[PDB]
Subunit: 225 residues, 4 copies
């Protein structure tokens, strides 16, 4: 009962720092405009760092889509999955509120909300988020698959660079959600909810798709009883 409390708190604190660091690095600084790579690196090294410190303790989901994917694959429980999703949403909003307080009334701007950019249709954007989240779930599972043992190597860095890869592309299209908590956090704080469902339907479908493809298509288990 105590280990479970530590895991839910860790998921909360992890999502707090990820959203706090991610958005804060994505704000429009006029003296040094953030590059697609700069933002991608911030989100990328963010997940890699948080996976290293807490991955072995709770799994370092830091993402409701990852938690849902883990719910379809990993022997996680619906109770923990709910407590995790709840912890991620609380940590994210807490990270966005903390950043808002410290960010002045000049940089804040859109507070790096994920927003449909370069017009683009919701169907085209929702399709990207699906493929963006799918590749992350495939990597996370392969990097953490116990059947591989210690053979996968650099788990934190691979997962981290996988998030960065999505961002290196996603920034230009949407912003690279891959995480409903990272999307909801600035939307609640700075009132902006333009097609928010896109950043929810996409990732959730992409995560379940990646989980089913991995756990039951690409590398399924042997037959049970």
């Amino acid at each position: 009962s105590i280990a479970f409390s530590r895991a839910v708190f860790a998921e909360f604190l992890a999502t707090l720092l990820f959203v706090f660091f991610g958005l804060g690095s994505a704000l429009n600084w006029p003296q040094a405009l953030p590059s697609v790579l700069q933002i991608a690196m911030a989100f990328g090294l963010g997940i890699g760092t948080l996976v290293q410190a807490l991955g072995h303790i709770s799994g370092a989901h830091i993402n409701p889509a990852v938690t849902v994917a883990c719910l379809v694959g990993c022997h996680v429980s619906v109770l923990r999955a709910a407590f995790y999703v709840a912890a991620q949403l609380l940590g994210a909003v807490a990270g966005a509120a903390l950043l808002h307080e410290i960010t002045p009334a000049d940089i804040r701007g859109d507070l790096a909300v994920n927003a449909l950019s370069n017009s683009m249709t919701a169907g085209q954007a929702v399709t990207v988020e699906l493929f963006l989240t799918l590749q992350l779930v495939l990597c996370i599972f392969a990097s953490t698959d116990e059947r591989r043992g210690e053979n996968p190597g650099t788990p934190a860095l691979s997962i981290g660079f996988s998030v960065a890869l999505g961002h290196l592309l996603g920034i230009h299209y949407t912003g690279c959600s891959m995480n409903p908590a990272r999307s909801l956090a600035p939307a609640v704080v700075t009132g902006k909810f333009d097609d928010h469902w896109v950043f929810w339907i996409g990732p959730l479908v992409g995560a379940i798709l990646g989980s089913l493809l991995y756990n039951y298509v690409l590398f399924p288990p042997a037959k049970s009883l």
Copy 2:
């Protein structure tokens, strides 16, 4: 029987995502033009992520030149190599078509086709593509060599950064093909095939040179008794 089907499917899906993520990051130029480093990182972390996710299930070739190199020292049969190459070509075109469908209308432009740049000669570009793929194949052979030391496991990041290294140079000339599928995918969708042979002869020759140099010159692998037989029977 199933494992082979899963492996061929993985090679298809891997090349799809690589081309989808790679080209999409190399075009898209509004008021944020992608830099050489930005593009190199996109292709590099792409392969690295896909080698990590699918390496243990198929080998994550994602490259016909890599599949050809593995035909000499990866224990890959010509049957698997063919099924892999076919899966890579289908995945790439599928990745470019999927990207094409979603592209923001009149944005595609070249669609990040590998193209001769800065008035250089076709011979100079084909020489680069050879060296770009030779160093990659050299790195893949060592990274997948049981005798390379360390502990069991494949370094997906090392392989990924090898692809990125090639882009830091190839981009200035072409786009760092190293992969005939990465070149054909946007060439088929758009229709631009200007000097398409450069993006095929270069990588294939560079890969075979690196594969022969590693398995016969640099670090000749340990032959099994059964493999050593075919050498004696091949002579006789």
Copy 3:
């Protein structure tokens, strides 16, 4: 013992040399070079790969703290004697000032400029900046403590790269606010060399509180030594 004595001397010398090279490389790469002004990512990579390289090269000799805040976090957390912590902090402060003085005598007077001093930026306030420095150093110690946690024996992992990228992560954000300190020696070094002590306490109070918070959170909240023999 005798060989036990030298080992400690090697550790103190390594902590000195590590902080010297870190400050020398970090500040030198952060200077406003006219032909190529460094970007936030460019600077983040210089400080990031700096710690990662020094942790890789010297971690197995001294622990490669290169930071008084992490040394203090190890006192409450990875419980180390105050003797080593003092010798380490002293070695870091001497190496840092030596690294900033060496760079000064290495850079042309014209390009020297602000010598990459930590300074309040974008008209920020001391209270907001001290809060940022806290969260920046907290995530670094959290990563260090987990990457070097005795309980993480078997597989070596990637502590150097993870810690290195953890420093870079703090720079991708901290640079815009304070230039990212996370280290009282990196802040004091250019302040002593080039007299600029504007809000120096921010670069000291912030990191130290963030490090102790991260050390207490890890050793007492996140993954403590379970007092009960049950597990």
Copy 4:
């Protein structure tokens, strides 16, 4: 004997081929500035990932020195023989010049320019520039020796990445002063081809001294090899 052995031939050839590919890729990615001038980070990454890739691919065959300074550092740290060290230095110098001549041929005359020669920049003094190169190569040799230290447990690829990121780190600083050499072969290769030898000694004394300094500090001061058996027994009880 060590000379007439396949392993020695493979190691000398590996050092040649490694320096060939490193110089070819390194200079070519750092000089190609037509309508897209490379940034300091871009150049640092090219040289960094260059060394990292070659150490991964060839490290197990020859040690992947790719540098006469590194080769000398291993000589000082009692590993490689003086015979092998000489053959390695010769292989590195031959590979480098071959890489620059090949790049010249493939690079259009309009963009070749100075061919990314290592040069004292922003009117730096010979004493200050030689001091930077010293500290640049010193940290690298410290990382290389630790990345190749059998006593340090590591996962596959990380040592090559650590060495790679060490080279990048050097370039992130050295570029502003000298263009970052750390390698006499990387400096000599374009100097012979293009013909610019102004104060070439800075790019040789600096790295050579930095490598020996780092090697002596590591093998004798910081982390010497033969320690004692019974200090571990005294740590126990």
